[PDB]
């Protein structure tokens, strides 16, 4: 298939692109490089075993989007582009709504213009809001995210749903990611956060690599087995693979296909720490800090639907998620070159 | 004050502009004329007794917005611009999200750029969603609107709220309108819908003027006194006046000020019909049709907050709302000239 991958040079998009190329699709990456570097492109080509086309541009540029879609005769679009720092979003709402809500609107409008009606959106478990019923199931009604970031994702899901209602031939997948971690097995590609990492794993990795002193565990008083937060960590490769399948199976299948993408099991902060200590052969230093604003105690996905409907399920373990991250972190301490 | 009135040539904006000019503020209207005509400008000037500045442009044009705000040293902005046909919104979601969500985002971003932090947004009772508790009070949590239009308004309220959180010096009023009707007493200005009117009053007026055969009453089986839908109709002049006060009193008052704007009482479809028959001296023809999709049975505002805090309350009656509309409709059967 001819697929446009927005945000294709980012963390999850890069991994998905390698998988797409492996399944022999023709990939065109669209990224503005605000959060990634061109240095990854060669790696994606190599690991993918095929050349993906790269266009530096912004999803907010509707005219460019339209031209791209036509010029490359795109069949389907995978939309990972956007801003995603939760904390930042609170301090800078406009930027989030613009890049995520308007960004997606400009892209789908371009799609409409170019007659492209196959779409896959990067959504997030935050859309469920403060849902006491766990695991989270797709049929649960959505909640109210507590940040501009989460609200921006929910708003896009709403808009896409309404778009489909109005243009029923559209096939739109809302892929709600859980907690993506891990890296390509080669250890040549991985998450490359600039500045302080906001997520657990990368933070751990930086402490482990000697860049940071101790990991601050946000809260030790939650109602969980060990008192620390619990989440559903999913390997970036399993996510990559899930996007490939979603894209292949759902193309031309009209509707709004919602799927949780996670392992379907929860792991606490200590569990992750322990898994990393084991992978890097030394104890990861850590300390207990206060609860982080907005954090829910525990949640994980109910991923049976993607299993049943797409025959998709995670295959990598927590150990591998820790090991693969350690490998990349260790093999590329300075991340992708400038 | 120096105020930028977006959508100033439209129905409610035009009336508000006359009131602003009467209170001697300097008004600059920004409208794209997609739903109004330049022919109203002279009328606004005359009735306002002062010349308002007019700029044809679109709220989605951030660069223009910014230039305008600076060039005219704006102090506060009243945002009525947007698309508002509920039914249309369902058939054409993108246009609604673009003009209403992105439209507002581009405007406030321009505001941020030009250092303008006083804002008034045209919101709507739909934001309360399917709220069984009536009347609706500002402290009730928001619900889920059933159309792209209502969702677009709720999304903007969310974005504006988050913007304020991040830029605490902003004074932002979310004015939730109920059912605006009526026209300037002169009968020289009023609502000028193009095509079939979606709202009750205008529809009635067109039947009354002989343009339409009968009024279709959507549902006669609701759980209301008379079986017809019940709403809180508010005279466009009282709304105009309420915006003037809001603007004067809230300027420079940091926060998110939410106020319901309505009469605080409900009237059924028959009540309105009867009031119009009386005003036009003949029976308005009507018939019973099936419930209109998405319609709630009955709701009205609890407008005590605006009373208490802004010392604002409606002063026009239902009769006057019917009479003033009949007057305009009758004095200008073809609406504003081309
Ligand atoms: N990593 C996570 O924990 C997480 C959880 C759920 C949802 N998501 C979503 O998945 C998507 C991919 O996440 P990721 O971890 O790979 O992030 P990332 O930052 O590594 O990838 C996003 C990419 O989009 C690009 N980009 C940003 N704004 C753009 C714009 N306006 N136009 C064009 N390119 C733009 C960035 O340069 C980057 O390469 C995002 O939408 C993210 O919100 C990820
Ligand atoms: N009339 C109602 O029943 C109702 C109820 C609640 C909320 N509102 C809101 O109040 C506001 C004013 O409503 P109204 O009845 O006067 O509508 P209107 O159509 O008469 O006024 C809106 C004006 O905005 C202009 N406009 C539209 N999109 C624009 C854009 N992108 N840039 C610049 N100008 C643009 C139109 O030309 C029009 O003059 C709207 O936002 C409406 O949603 C009204
Ligand atoms: O330095 C750190 C970082 C994280 N945590 C804890 O680690 C767990 C995971 O935290 P983090 O990696 O920040 O994950 P989330 O808060 O779950 O957020 C991610 O997962 C969500 C879906 O589950 C998405 O909505 C978000 O965009 C994505 O960043 C939580 O209990 C955090 O309290 C710490 O104790 N210390
Ligand atoms: O031809 C018509 C038109 C309307 N109605 C009834 O009249 C009442 C008022 O209907 P309408 O004028 O369309 O009002 P709303 O549906 O209440 O919607 C208006 O009021 C809302 C706030 O209350 C806003 O959210 C909307 O944008 C605005 O159009 C309702 O019970 C309708 O069922 C009829 O029976 N026949
Ligand atoms: Na339709
Ligand atoms: Na960063
Ligand atoms: Na320590
Ligand atoms: Na680096
Ligand atoms: Na802040
Ligand atoms: Na019309
Ligand atoms: Na009849
Ligand atoms: Na006319």
Cβ atoms of residues A12 and A19 within 8 Å: no
Q: Are residues B174 and B282 in the same domain?
A: no
Q: Are residues A107 and A32 in the same domain?
A: yes
Residue B212, token pair as written in the block: 């339409």
* Three-state secondary-structure class, residue B246: helix
CA separation for the pair B221, B335 (Å, rounded): 35
Q: Are residues B223 and B101 in the same domain?
A: no
Q: Are residues B227 and B247 in the same domain?
A: no
**Pairing relationship of beta strands B267-268 and B230-231 according to DSSP bridges:** antiparallel
Show which residues on chain A lie within 8 Å of chain B, measured between beta carbons. 90-94, 97-98, 101-102, 105, 108-109, 112, 148, 151, 155, 158-159, 162-163, 165-166
Its domain, for residue B211, covers: 182-231+263-338
Cβ atoms of residues A255 and A164 within 8 Å: yes
Of the listed ligands, the closest to the CA of A90 is 9
Residue A286, token pair as written in the block: 């850590």
CA separation for the pair A56, A79 (Å, rounded): 15
Q: In the block, which residue shows the tokens 């508002």? A: B84
CB atoms within 10 A of CB B141: 8
Q: Specify the experimental method.
A: X-ray
Q: In 3D, which of A13, A37, A25, A18 has the Cα closest to residue A121?
A: A13
Mutate to test the interface with B, among A83, A158, A170 (most CBs of B within 10 A): A158
CA separation for the pair A75, A212 (Å, rounded): 44
Residue that is last in its domain, among B262, B277, B309: B262
CA separation for the pair B94, B168 (Å, rounded): 31
Q: Are residues A311 and A240 in the same domain?
A: no
Chain B residue nearest residue A87, CA to CA: B166
Ligand 9 geometric centre to CA of A160 (Å): 30
Distance, CA of B233 to chain centre: 11
**DSSP alpha helix (H) spans, chain B:** 11-22, 40-48, 62-71, 86-91, 93-96, 103-113, 148-166, 200-208, 236-250, 269-280, 304-310, 318-331
Q: Is A99 in the pocket of ligand 1 (CB under 6 A)?
A: yes
Q: What angle do CA A314, A315, A319 make, to 5 degrees?
A: 105
Q: Are residues A99 and A174 in the same domain?
A: yes
CB atoms within 10 A of CB A10: 26
Q: Are residues B150 and B18 in the same domain?
A: yes
Per 3-state DSSP, what percentage of chain A is helix, strand, and coil (rounded to 5)?
40, 20, 40
Residue B337, token pair as written in the block: 């000239």
Q: Are residues B22 and B71 in the same domain?
A: yes
CA separation for the pair B250, A197 (Å, rounded): 41
Burial of residue B8 (number of CB atoms within 10 Å: 0-12, 13-18, 19+): buried
Q: Are residues A16 and A78 in the same domain?
A: yes
Check CB contact under 8 Å for A97 and B159. Answer: yes
For residue B256, give the H/E element and its range: strand B255-261
Contact residues, chain B, for A93 at CB < 8 Å: 159, 162-163, 165-166
CATH of residue B87's domain is 3.40.50.720
Q: What is the CA radius of gyration of chain B?
A: 19
Check CB contact under 8 Å for B109 and A98. Answer: yes
CA separation for the pair B319, B144 (Å, rounded): 33
> Which residues make Cβ contacts (< 8 Å) with residue A108, sequence separation at least 6?
A119, A159, A160, A163, B94
Q: Are residues A93 and A107 in the same domain?
A: yes
Ligand 3 geometric centre to CA of B272 (Å): 55
**Pairing relationship of beta strands A179-181 and A267-268 according to DSSP bridges:** unpaired
Q: Are residues A59 and A145 in the same domain?
A: yes
Residue B255, token pair as written in the block: 């926060």
Cβ atoms of residues B232 and B263 within 8 Å: yes
Residue A29, token pair as written in the block: 């990456």
Q: Are residues B30 and B125 in the same domain?
A: yes
Documented resolution in Å:
1.8
Show which residues on chain B lie within 8 Å of chain A, measured between beta carbons. 90-94, 97-98, 101-102, 105, 108-109, 112, 148, 151, 155, 158-159, 162-163, 165-166
CA separation for the pair B113, B74 (Å, rounded): 12
Cβ atoms of residues A253 and A117 within 8 Å: no
How many folded domains does chain A comprise?
A: 2
The torsion angles phi and psi of B35, rounded to 5 degrees, stand at -135, 15
Cβ atoms of residues B183 and B327 within 8 Å: yes
CATH of residue A222's domain is 3.90.25.10
The strand order across the sheet containing B26-31 reads: B53-56, B26-31, B2-6, B76-79, B118-124, B171-177, B255-261
Of the listed ligands, the closest to the CA of B131 is 4
Q: What is the DSSP letter of A223?
A: S
Cβ atoms of residues A47 and A328 within 8 Å: no
């Amino acid at each position: 298939m001819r697929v446009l991958v927005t945000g294709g040079s980012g963390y999850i998009g890069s991994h998905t692109c390698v998988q797409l190329l492996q399944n022999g699709h023709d990939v065109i990456i669209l990224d503005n490089l605000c959060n990634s570097k061109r240095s990854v492109l060669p790696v994606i080509e190599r690991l993918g075993g095929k050349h993906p086309t790269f266009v530096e541009g912004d999803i907010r540029n509707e005219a460019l989007m339209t031209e791209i879609l036509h010029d490359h005769a795109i069949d389907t679009v995978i939309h990972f582009a956007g801003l995603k720092a939760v904390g930042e979003s609170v301090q800078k709402p406009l930027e989030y709504y613009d890049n995520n809500v308007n960004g997606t609107l400009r892209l789908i409008s371009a799609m409409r213009a170019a007659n492209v009606k196959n779409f896959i959106f990067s959504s997030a478990a935050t859309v469920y809001g403060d849902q006491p019923k766990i695991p989270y199931v797709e049929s649960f009604p959505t909640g109210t995210p507590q940040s501009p970031f989460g609200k921006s994702k929910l708003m896009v899901e709403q808009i896409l749903t309404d778009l489909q209602k109005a243009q029923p031939d559209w096939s739109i997948a809302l892929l709600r990611y859980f907690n993506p971690v891990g890296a390509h097995p080669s250890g040549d590609m991985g998450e490359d956060p600039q500045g302080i990492p906001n997520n657990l794993m990368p933070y751990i990795a930086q402490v482990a690599v000697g860049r940071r002193d101790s990991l601050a565990i946000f809260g030790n008083d939650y109602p969980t087995e060990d008192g620390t937060g619990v989440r559903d960590y999913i390997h970036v490769m399993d996510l990559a693979d899930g996007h490939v399948v979603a894209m292949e199976k759902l193309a031309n299948k009209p509707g709004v296909h919602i799927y949780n993408l996670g392992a379907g099991v929860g792991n606490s902060v200590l569990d992750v720490v322990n898994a990393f200590s084991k992978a890097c052969g030394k104890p990861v230093n850590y300390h207990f800090a206060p609860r982080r604003e907005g954090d829910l105690p525990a949640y994980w996905a109910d991923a049976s639907k993607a299993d049943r409907e797409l025959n998709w399920r995670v295959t990598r373990t927590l150990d591998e998620m820790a090991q693969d991250t350690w490998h990349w972190q260790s093999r590329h301490p300075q991340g992708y070159p400038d």
